[PDB]
Symmetry: C3
């Protein structure tokens, strides 16, 4: 027992929600204990019911958000149940050494491993499976990616000496999928990940996804699963993309404070319309809602947003502010005396 710190077990929750944590803490460093269980399974990824052979951490795309503080140690038990068919591992972009931990975590079905990494770098970071060679992109675009947030012990700040505090946090994992089609253009189904591989790799090589989804499927965060907020709340939106660039935008809002490269040692940018998540990274945006109603959260390649699945909704309760925006005149016939050339 060389490392003599208190230990705290964390129970992960499914995205887009985040496990209970403190923003600012006066506790000293701890060993924060997390468990991730690999689950290979067929999953529905669009509104027409298209399936595909997914590979996940903890049964979700993305994998769950892990939250710790600068100077904590993160002790992760990775489990690969014997019902799975492939070896798996984990690479933390937050970690230092051994390919992020991938070189110390390769486990066959039936095995588990325990990795500890010190959280020396603040920000939001990707974690993903990376077995080796061509298996790396395949496992990641099959769903094996998530994120970790390493908060400063004093919480977030605006880079100019003022504390920032969120009222709510959501984790939006964006996934690019490469689903094979038959000669007629219909999506193909397979009985195992291994059976899907060869055809999937051919799609992957052309670098054009068939689907781009939030929380694992088209429409996952719309309708009854819209994200809730209230006028006045400061909401932190963490966005990850393990393989491909994204350009987040909150339709009808802004990013008040945006860390687009995702690292809290850098001052955020202010008042952004659209920001940029480079493939292989996580970023974060804070916004204080000023108006009630529906907001669409998109990647602002609108073809991807509307036609390949990458739209979420916020439903925001409160009172409308006519000073910020108003309909002066409702739709009406163009007046006869008008000249509109």
């Amino acid at each position: 027992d060389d490392l003599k710190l208190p230990r705290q077990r964390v129970d992960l929750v499914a995205p887009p929600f985040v496990h209970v944590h403190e923003q600012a803490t006066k506790q000293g460093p701890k060993i924060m204990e997390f468990k991730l269980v690999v689950q290979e399974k067929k999953m529905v990824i669009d509104e027409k019911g298209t399936t595909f052979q997914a590979m996940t951490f903890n049964g979700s795309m993305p994998g769950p958000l892990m939250v710790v503080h600068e100077g904590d140690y993160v002790e992760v038990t990775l489990v690969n149940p014997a019902t799975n068919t492939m070896p798996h591992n984990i690479d933390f972009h937050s970690a230092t050494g051994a390919l992020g931990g991938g070189a110390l975590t390769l486990i066959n079905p039936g095995e588990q491993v325990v990795l500890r990494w010190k959280a020396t770098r603040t920000g939001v970071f990707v974690y993903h499976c990376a077995p080796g060679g061509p298996m790396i992109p395949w496992h990641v675009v099959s769903g094996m990616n998530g994120a970790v947030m390493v908060l400063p012990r004093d919480g977030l700040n605006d880079g100019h000496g003022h504390s920032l505090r969120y009222d709510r946090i959501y984790y939006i994992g964006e996934q690019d999928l490469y689903v094979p089609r038959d000669e007629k253009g219909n999506f193909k189904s397979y009985d195992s990940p291994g059976e899907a591989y060869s055809d999937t790799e051919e799609v992957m090589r052309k670098l054009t996804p068939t689907h781009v989804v939030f929380n694992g499927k088209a429409g996952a965060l719309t309708g009854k699963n819209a994200l809730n907020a209230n006028v006045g709340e400061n909401v932190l939106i963490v966005h990850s993309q393990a393989n491909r660039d994204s350009r987040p935008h909150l339709i009808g809002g802004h990013g008040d404070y945006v860390w687009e490269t995702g690292k809290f040692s850098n001052a955020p940018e202010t008042g952004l319309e659209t920001w940029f998540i480079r493939g292989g990274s996580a970023g974060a945006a804070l916004y204080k809602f000023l108006q009630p109603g529906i907001y669409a959260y998109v990647t602002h390649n609108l073809i991807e947003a509307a036609n390949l699945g990458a739209t979420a909704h916020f439903k925001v309760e409160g009172k409308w502010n006519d000073d910020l925006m108003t309909q002066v005149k409702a739709p009406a016939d163009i007046p006869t005396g008008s000249t509109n050339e």
Copy 2:
């Protein structure tokens, strides 16, 4: 009449030019009145005369640049003449609430609407049509996008307490187009936007444009339509892309001051070679010309620049500075005594 401010009607001009405005102002907030008239029409988009079924604000791709100051109110009359075939609306990324105004501006052919939004956020911002669902990307990549600039009341600054003033301003709207081809590879023509839709959507889904153009067509800002400047002038170049990333570069120049995310509350970066406009945003670059001659302004995917249409020219008058650059020896035969291995 709740809002008791002076009203000023603005007459928009066609890009790449910009309507008359003040950089710094000591006037108080005003209600700035703008009129935008939707025009569906066939347009020529390349040097071989390829046509396509465009949808525009005010008859241009991009739509005109609107310029106001922080704290002004922007009252926009959107008109959809009965000669048009589709409903249209407008979403201002500069605005707060109702999907940027899209949820308050949906108008059928024969109708108009009046929206007012308060200009609370400084920078350059996209505006675009967004009717709903798959119509959103289709209307935007058919040409229904422009930009608005919200200046600080004191004008631009370098983020370090020094005023910046431009001598000239140009607005470069970049448009990604998705023109269907027949089995031989020739571009297809249609008699209406509705007829073009199904084939266009198939091209859109593969996320590879057929054309990437400035000011609505290949070659629009070359030859007799090159952009004018003079040695010593500080020129502000506003660049928008409503759907797809761009990487602007001034060949033979630099960006002296660049707001690549486009928001004046953030200090600009200095001395850039190439900058990055994320899809769904506008950015701005200031450059003081130091040499006369032709400059090419490109997106620095050179395939897009040279082969898909995305090159503009500046023609700059003045005297050559041999200290910054000189041809020491003109092209000449390689000397016989040379060894060139």
Copy 3:
């Protein structure tokens, strides 16, 4: 002889290595003399032995890194030997005027030219061939690109008044290639660049590379050609991409200090996981190695990294730090008493 400064001849070296230079200097400005010889040749670009008709500066993809200091003059002799088939030129993004020098350097086979440019802007910058029209992207994606670094005379700094010094420097040139395929999907071979052009241009137009390589071929910087370092060394990694965006990531490390837009007048960002090189630019990252072993340096589109060629290796000598990372428990059977749902 108007310009009366000392002259220093520099001998370029092949990437990823860099010619001898000083970081900080107290010498005054000099005329720094460089020679670049165009070489058209067939080159191997992947591990299956695929060839293609390359065009290079000095026989390498990328062309060599040139290093000077702010206020130096750079006098470049460009040579186009009579064994070559095409005209060539050079455009320095570091330079001011005449399309970066391209308008003053067009040379036929059998000719040479001498251009001088003043190094007024600090940072890392692309240089590339740009003959005119469609020849510009073709020459660049055929291999005719490199970089120049213009250091501040006091060396690098952290933008907050502290000097930064590297122990080692590597130049990673990333190249997107567009190799034609036959009806069966096999890569086509040609006897000259001219013969390859028409088919190559068709691939280029679809904006999807067949290969994305570091130092001119898949696997170039892996195995016996891995990049060396030691625990404790501060290594500067210069990364260029003349045509297409890249997202560099050091697997198992970070960017301690990153200039992603590549210009030293801007403070670096700290503690990045992944950074972004916009097409048509160079950037630079400093990292101090903390752990020994193998590191993969990738573009973090992992399909490009693993399947299209864009992976380099570092081999780092030193002692493992179990405080930063440790394998708490090696792979072992999942305990019988476990519940893993």
